[PDB]
Amino acid sequence: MRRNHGRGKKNRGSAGSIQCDKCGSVTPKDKAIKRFRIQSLIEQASFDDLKQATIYDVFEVPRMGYKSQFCVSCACHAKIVRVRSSQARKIRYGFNPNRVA
């Protein structure tokens, strides 16, 4: 099916394992599906009422980053990842750390 054989591991024997965030099953770290997100600490449909409540003259709402980790059954079921066709299976998407802002 895949030339990966399903996981990003090259030229090493073993690679460490983790426990899935939803069911808790044991999986290699290079095979798990991993996602990163930055969420506002306060909901967006609440910003107006928070501008009259604040006592400080200048306030910044905080943001946190979260890394998640799931197994193949839990990501497929939750629709985090979907079935693709034979040729579209080969397309990888990245981040580009050299972007300007």
List of residues contacting RNA (CB under 7 A) = 3-5, 8, 10-16, 29-30, 34, 36, 67, 79, 82-83, 86, 90, 92
Min dist CB 67 to Zn ion, Å, is 16
| Contacted entry of RNA, Zn ion, none for residue 8, CB cut-off 5 to 8 Å set by kind | RNA
In the bound state with Zn ion, the residue whose beta carbon lies nearer, of 6 and 40, is 6
Min dist CB 53 to Zn ion, Å, is 40
CA–CA separation, 46 vs 58, rounded Å?
Answer: 17
Single out the residue of 81, 82, 68, 86 nearest to residue 22, CA to CA. Answer: 68
Helix ranges (DSSP H) in the chain: 47-53, 72-77
CB 34 within 8 A of CB 69: yes
Residues that bind Zn ion (CB under 5 A): 20, 22-23, 71, 74
